[PDB]
């Protein structure tokens, strides 16, 4: 919510609002942004957490909401994005573990990931292939750099990848002071062994590190959240 | 009105807190959402986010049918809807979710009403069903603080894998037979027909090493079966004994 | 009915066929590597006689094939069966005169063999130098509409950026446009514009997988 404003707001914002220094100029925005790198940040739950913040139209658009047991219906519900999206009001559509389905293995037999990139591939053909983009641009994100795809290399495919680091103290605290910008901060938070314990956990475990660190604060007498909490709960969960 | 609506409403308070035994932190992690939450909603507010949503009953069935029977009798005196496994997995399917919306309109006519999905262990009839129920249950519309705990048998595992690292957490287990845990379903038992205060409860308890709630529930109801069966007039464990020691062996033989 | 445009040193074809389809194509009729997925027993056959014979029924039809290179034990048996649908497709009977189709690859090694004799890929074509002079071209006739600051060179950002395509130079003037945009000024240091170019371009090279 913090973190990232500018990328966000004037990548959605401009492609609209400044249309006559388009003209003016003759450049095209970039459409196609990637919140990739290791875990621990929370792409999912912050990154659905600013799709609110925009204030713009939002449709939700999951793993298992595009792969159906049937065929054919993948392209079904790519043009039917395309119909709310491209036909509709502009809305904010963004996915997430992309790396998982970029799979391009030597044996074609049998590969499941080929038929998703067969609907993925349609989609990037529906790019690629359709200059006119400056309506509803794709915005997708990976929590891992182990397979890329090297088709996303386009204005209108994934172009502004945007790397973010493993959440050291610096980060861990950027993300957590987000996380935690509006609830009760007592003044003895000094973030740094909880921010140093949080490894190999994503921003949707560091969040039920925060509800747990909302359990015990009953008990303890303190109607606020104290520093040790948060390690309290770390250890509590692992 | 169907019989599922005249059916849901959960009524003659079952079971209570009295049998409080062997698996104590689990039924307390489970107590302290569907109690805490709704009887102090003005410090989990200023506490913090949000408070717990709910856990997970997986696993071995132990004293199945007993836990939530304790959430129903420990309610605040507002009872709350509960909903069976039985009645997603039916014939003439697309029935699912005019049902699975309506009782969430009648959870609005009952200012927020809890919602609980009991033995959810009962192909794109299914699909619809659990990904439209996770596109009820997690999504903002009907509510996202009410209620959500799937107590069962099985988990019938097509999604968690993924699905599960989100607004659901806290993966534990359902129950576990001890040996001093039965005294206090026993103690429960009581209530049940006039037995003779003389027989110790722990004497019927020891005899019994390894068993789970349904094994002495099967003591209690078995007994009762053959109690009646005896044409008698008081129930004293000297007549239907052959009961208990073949009601806990001939069972323990295979489970 | 068919060409083969392949460059031993380095990669990115099918921005070339995004070139020339960017430039003239005039015919949308698209065609993925991941249609031949076979999950199945193998029935191919039904969608090459379908597919061509919408071909056939259609009279708009230039098709681009493109990642060829991770699809090329029965892992070849599948491929010769294709390909003698193809055979049976610009062999027998048929329109060759309303089809047209380009395939695309990766690396110089799995240029499939099979593909390599002739009747299936007939002009085959080695590009060592990318067309300087057409990429030259293609900068002098696509700087335009572009309005960069007065002290330019073409050939200097020409001989900076090379091995990929014209056109992907087109994309990196314009990325420095995209970027000039950003800085919310017409003309600006070229600081900036050699700032595209390495970053860009040379992250062109190394995401270039």
């Keep these: 919510l913090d973190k990232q404003i500018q990328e966000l707001v004037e990548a959605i914002v401009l492609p609209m609002n400044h249309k006559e220094k388009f003209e003016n100029l003759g450049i095209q925005p970039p459409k196609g942004v990637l919140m990739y790198g290791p875990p621990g940040t929370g792409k999912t739950l912050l990154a659905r957490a600013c799709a609110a913040q925009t204030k713009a139209t939002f449709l939700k658009l999951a793993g298992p909401q595009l792969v159906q047991m049937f065929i054919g219906d993948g392209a079904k519900l790519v043009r039917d994005a395309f ?16 790396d998982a389905i970029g799979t391009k293995r030597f044996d074609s037999e049998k590969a499941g990931d080929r038929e998703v990139q067969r609907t993925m591939l349609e989609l990037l053909n529906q790019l690629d292939g359709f200059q006119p983009n400056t309506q509803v641009k794709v915005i997708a994100a990976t929590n891992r750099v182990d397979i890329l795809d090297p088709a996303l290399l386009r204005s209108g495919r994934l ?11 610096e980060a861990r605290a950027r993300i957590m002071q987000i996380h935690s910008r509006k609830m009760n901060v007592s003044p003895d938070v000094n973030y740094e062994e909880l921010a140093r314990c949080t490894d190999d956990f994503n921003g949707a475990q560091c969040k039920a590190v925060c509800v747990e660190a909302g359990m015990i604060a009953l008990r303890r007498g303190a109607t606020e959240l104290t520093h040790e909490d948060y390690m309290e709960g770390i250890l509590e969960v692992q | 009105d169907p019989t599922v609506t005249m059916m849901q409403v959960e009524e003659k308070p079952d079971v209570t807190y009295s049998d409080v035994g062997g698996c104590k932190e689990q039924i307390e992690k489970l107590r302290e959402v569907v109690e805490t ?16 949503k709910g856990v997970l009953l997986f696993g071995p069935p132990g004293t199945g049918k007993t836990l939530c029977a304790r959430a129903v009798a ?3 005196d507002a009872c709350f809807i509960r909903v069976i496994g039985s009645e997603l997995v039916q014939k003439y399917v697309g029935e699912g979710a005019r049902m699975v919306r309506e009782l969430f309109e009648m959870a609005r006519t009952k200012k927020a009403c809890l919602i609980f999905f009991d033995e959810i262990d009962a192909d794109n009839e299914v699909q619809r069903t659990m990904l439209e129920l996770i596109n009820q249950l997690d999504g903002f519309d009907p509510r996202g603080n009410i209620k959500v705990l799937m107590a069962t048998n099985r988990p019938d595992t097509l999604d968690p894998a993924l699905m599960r690292p989100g607004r659901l957490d806290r993966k534990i287990e359902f129950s576990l037979p001890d040996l001093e845990g039965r005294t206090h379903i026993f103690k429960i038992h009581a209530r049940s027909m006039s ?3 003389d027989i110790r409860f722990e004497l019927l308890a020891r005899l019994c090493p390894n068993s789970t709630g349904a094994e002495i529930r099967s003591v209690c109801t078995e007994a009762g079966m053959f109690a009646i069966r005896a044409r008698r007039k008081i129930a004293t464990e000297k007549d239907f004994l052959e009961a208990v020691n073949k009601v806990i062996k001939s069972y323990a033989k295979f489970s | 009915k068919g060409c083969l445009l392949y460059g031993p040193p380095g990669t990115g074809k099918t921005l070339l066929a995004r070139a020339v389809a960017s430039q003239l194509d005039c015919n949308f009729l698209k065609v993925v590597s991941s249609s031949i997925v076979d999950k199945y027993i193998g029935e191919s056959a039904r969608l090459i006689r379908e597919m061509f014979n919408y071909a056939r029924d259609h009279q708009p039809c230039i098709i681009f094939m493109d990642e060829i290179d991770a699809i090329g034990t029965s892992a070849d048996r599948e491929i010769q069966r294709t390909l003698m649908e193809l055979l049976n497709q610009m062999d027998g009977f048929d329109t060759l005169h309303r089809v047209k189709m380009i395939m695309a690859t990766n690396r110089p090694d799995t240029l499939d063999p099979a593909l390599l004799r002739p009747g299936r890929l007939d002009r085959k074509i080695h590009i060592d130098l990318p067309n300087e002079q057409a990429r030259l071209d293609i900068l002098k006739i696509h700087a335009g509409p572009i309005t960069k600051h007065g002290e330019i060179d073409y050939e200097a950002i020409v001989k900076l950026s090379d091995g990929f395509n014209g056109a992907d130079l087109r994309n990196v003037c314009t990325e420095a446009g995209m970027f000039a ?4 000024h017409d003309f600006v240091v070229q600081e900036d514009f050699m700032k595209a170019v390495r970053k860009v371009a040379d992250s ?4 270039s997988k």
Excluded: Y
């Excluded at chain 1, 172009?159 to 103290?169: G, L």
């Excluded at chain 2, 939450?37 to 717990?52: D, M, W």
């Excluded at chain 3, 062109?204 to 995401?207: M, P």
């Design chain 1, 83 to 98: 119909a709310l999206a491209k036909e509709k009001a502009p809305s904010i559509i963004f996915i997430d573990e992309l």
């Design chain 2, 74 to 76: 420990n309610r605040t």
């Design chain 2, 195 to 197: 037995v003779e205060r």
């Design chain 3, 204 to 207: 062109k090279k190394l995401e």
């Design chain 1, 159 to 169: 172009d502004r990848k945007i790397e973010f680091p493993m959440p050291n103290e």
């Design chain 3, 181 to 184: 945009i950003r800085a919310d």
């Design chain 2, 37 to 52: 939450p709704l009887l102090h909603p003005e410090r989990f507010v200023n506490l913090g986010i949000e408070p717990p």
